[model samples]
Target: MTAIREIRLSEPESAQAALLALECAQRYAEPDSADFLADAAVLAHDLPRAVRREVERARLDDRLHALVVRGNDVDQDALGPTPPHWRQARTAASRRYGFLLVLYASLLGDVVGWATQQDGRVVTDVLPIEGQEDSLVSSSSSVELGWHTEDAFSPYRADYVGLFSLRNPDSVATTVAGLDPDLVGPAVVDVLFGERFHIRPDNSHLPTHNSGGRLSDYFAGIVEAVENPRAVSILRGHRDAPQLCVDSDFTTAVDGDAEAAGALDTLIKHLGGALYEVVLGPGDVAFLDNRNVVHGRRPFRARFDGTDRWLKRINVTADLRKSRAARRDAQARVLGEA
Candidate 1:
């Protein structure tokens, strides 16, 4: 986790506009503006040129387009809920947004992040939110979070991922960024130093166990191998961009198949203060690299209490990749549900 820089996009006008839109939404969203329950007009196009420009300038527009809507807007004609299914339905929006948040700041190209609410449904075990899911949360303890790229589970994988927190659970920040924290750094050094592993290509997971088997672990631990076992860099960096295959649910790590366990250990240990751990109160945001970082979570006890820590999350890709369009045009697809 490199040092994360924050740019609060709370410009006076945008804030006022967002405020006005929410007022209308609140009437329909019920008791709270939580989760943007009511459709937000902020997603509306054809607004006065100035307001539209400010929202775009504020980057809210990107969050609304590429992230929140999958490039469409909401209305009778609006595609509907932000399903993760190929830009049509909002199925895996959660994970994709988280990954993109991290990549936003870590990339050299276009980046995007979103503001999301708990919606009272626990989406990922990377962090604990009571009343949510993954009930038995603890150290290295993972839950059956569906496979998706934080938010890309919706459109396409982002060269980078960003996860900004508008609100969160009890002192727990919600675990999403601490993937093999103890493994990434050491693994990168080995790769840069000439050590390498045979890369494997496959994915599988067991929801009943709340964890994926060997494949999941192997993919997550690819960089730290000593021998040329089937492995790949946890973070695949290209000349100008990188893409992360961070769904620990379907990746694995084979024992002596690659290198000694400790060999990879030295390579990953980068989670301490080096990982960007920022708290976003009412007006705050955090970014990440989907390609460079593996994210996880700390658990939290949700109140069912709407007051539970809430964060607005979104996902974005620097530019469209060939497969990206293919994924989105298809339909919203759930990873393990089928």
Candidate 2:
């Protein structure tokens, strides 16, 4: 199976995407809200023909885990120094790049975001946080983020997780692992295909340390998901290859199920051997197939001096209605905790 694929955009294709991004930034710059998720769908149809075709093909090819587009232009200096925090990062070229990510992701599916993550911003800033460098979330740098399906606890999780690299002077690698037909025996696969696993919510979705009031209610909702996760199979879809859902950091076998526990353990060992990295640099964008692959990032030291690895992330769904209950209304795309 094709685990990953890469496309180096031609000069005109790259220029066109950038130009379209600037247009989107000027037209859709808004409540600085997640509202742009839909606008991107309307605008993405106008993207360059070649890039549009690529996204369509990638979206349908389930064997592929990720599609990387390289050599787009990013003026780091004009984008300004990396922000100290997510709030500070949403200006200048960084903001434009965020629009670019939405535009590209819209071609694949409906763009979505977590209301609890980074205050429900559609375009999330992924720079290192000073105090969180040793933590496990995306903002952490010193400690490696373990491979996991994005929002593994939810049945309504994104089909594609998109990221646009604004800067990465150190070339920090993003790790990815996917299920391959040749790797495991049928007996193990059968056990994984059964519903004997539970995935807790990852730490990234938890509430702030001192959060309160209505925010506390939001936090409680997520805590409940962690405490009482729904049962799920580690694999689904075609029996030969299948799709994956268990997160190394957060997934666990059902209680007292020794057979399931052993299957989970075996799957973990295979994934460890299957893992690989795709190091993205400035102007690189990747859309990972969230259904079939698990992904994470390696540990790297942060300069914390206005220059560090930074990326903009967004989630995409093939069918928006799958998450309707998680949203406030038909117009809202930021999802609430289940």
Candidate 3:
């Protein structure tokens, strides 16, 4: 059974008050700003004690796949219409919710962003774009996003992937699966733990997503990763509680390594059998353990008339200093500049 952990606010009003206080203290600055993120890390201590306790427990427990925080009142009318594209997503109406997401994320760790994704915005929008319906990225509506570890290709990938739902009229389910150590034989596990798999960077980091003149270096780095992916293991750490790293649509075995190929195939089939769905609603936030769980989305038809599933997402790293070389400075959260 795929049991996902969850915590509902006992005092929703009090929690909302805490969030508003932080929002007001930040003086309505952009959530992506260095000053705001730094302040959020410290101010997050003021959130409800119960909520923080549950989140802290989840952080220490490696066996838990994901944790859902519910009952944080979301004013749908104040959030306004879902933008057609991510570029036009940020607005005065939706700014507070963005801050809310970061505040919740700060409880676990520092939230980071990719220079190649969404123009380096720390908090990114996840709504269906009109022209990207058939694409594989988060913005696609017609194509179901395949199950994968968020940023599986990079070593500095987030330890946790946070999603806060502002609206979900259709109740589209988010798919998730974890590794079952008992399902695999010892022989396959041996191969899976070896450095024989190649995981390519996902299309979300493509140049098309980041089209600024200054982003040329970042896009070039993406092209390099795609052309020459490093050989890495699909599994790591303890055998009984192994960590997972594979993109269902982008991971593969090296050429002529039939043993590795067979192992990869077996692992994929096992995860497919173990897959389950979680439907997030408005005022709900979930943090998926990127090291243990792979998550995706169920395909849903889009409504161009403004009522669509809109979400705010952020990537959190347990240790931010590990990626210091990739970031421009000690305070910068966006990676790949260096």
Candidate 4:
């Protein structure tokens, strides 16, 4: 099987699926099939890949599983006027840039998956609101966005945070994540590769787990002294898949390490506008190495309608060997986001 190995944001075949995905994407904005999601993700893959893929992505909780896969709106609308960037993504769809996000998720049930809901009362898809607040994402939809890894609080860090743009955010111009040789200097490798920082509970309405509570928590003082001084470790873990977690507004350095903070800001600014930005459409999907890149969004206007800029998010963890166990445990505890 000439399979597309681990997908990347910097690759081309990845772009190919993005286009193909939009085709399938348009058909199910508000699907009626009890098995549509099950079938949709398996579109390009071999049959063997489909059945097992569905089983793995679910939570073993009988009740929760029902709520998650319940036949509902396929689009999960983010209603309102989308950001300028979102409009551009629509434009890209018109031009046909690949929406590989969904495609990649389908192939490797281990690394990526998809998630969307009906056009609920909520306006923004990824944005934080009263009941849906989060530390990694901004609650307000007006600021020039910052970048960071996806789901730092989950028990297992994600191998890839695949972006399947069923809808776009604000504008068309999102800053590229510049970690390339041209952008990030040699020091970045040293810091980012040096040590794995603690991943704690983000202050967003989400859980604030202590080190014992969660791996994403920052060392005690990592947040307080971070802003002006810029605290952080470019590196995240010694594991095979180490992820760097940051929330300029939430994460901080251990013991208020001023030098460390400065290092972090330098790293972020250097990487600002450095990622390969592209506008996605219906089937367009983009994947990022959460361990390697920090993604952020741009500011945009909102009308709070049902068709606002929307992107279906799927979190992919690499440890498939423990997939069964994770689901069992997920049912018992906090693995809902895992």
Q: Who wins the lDDT comparison? A: 3
Give a tens-digit lDDT track for model 2, residues 123-234.
7878998899887788999999988999888887899999899999999999999876566788888888898999988887887522233366667667988889878988
Q: Candidate 1 residues 1-338, lDDT tens each? A: 12233333435534443444344443433212223312222323422345344324434221111111111111221212322211121223233233222222223233222111121121222222333355332212134333223532222344443334433434444333433423454545444323233333212112222323323432222222222434444444352233344343333334453453343343334332333333444323344445454454543344443334434343434553333323222221111111
**TM value for model 1:** 0.45
Provide the RMSD of all predictions against the true structure, rounded to 1 decimal: 11.4, 1.9, 1.6, 11.6
Residue-wise C-alpha lDDT for candidate 3, range 222-316, written one tens digit per residue: 78889999999999999988899999999999988999999999988988777888998987899999999999999999998889899999999
Cα-based lDDT for every prediction:
0.32, 0.83, 0.87, 0.40
Worst 10 residues of 4 by lDDT: 63-72
Stronger candidate by TM-score (1 vs 4): 4
Number of clashing residue pairs, candidate 2: 0
Better of 1 and 3 by lDDT: 3
Task: Give the clash count for each candidate.
Answer: 89, 0, 0, 50
Stretches of candidate 2 off by over 4 Å are: 31-35, 209-214
How well does each candidate superpose onto the true structure, as a TM-score?
0.45, 0.95, 0.96, 0.53
For residue 45, model 1's alpha carbon misses the true position, in angstroms, by 11
Ordered list by TM-score, greatest first: 3, 2, 4, 1
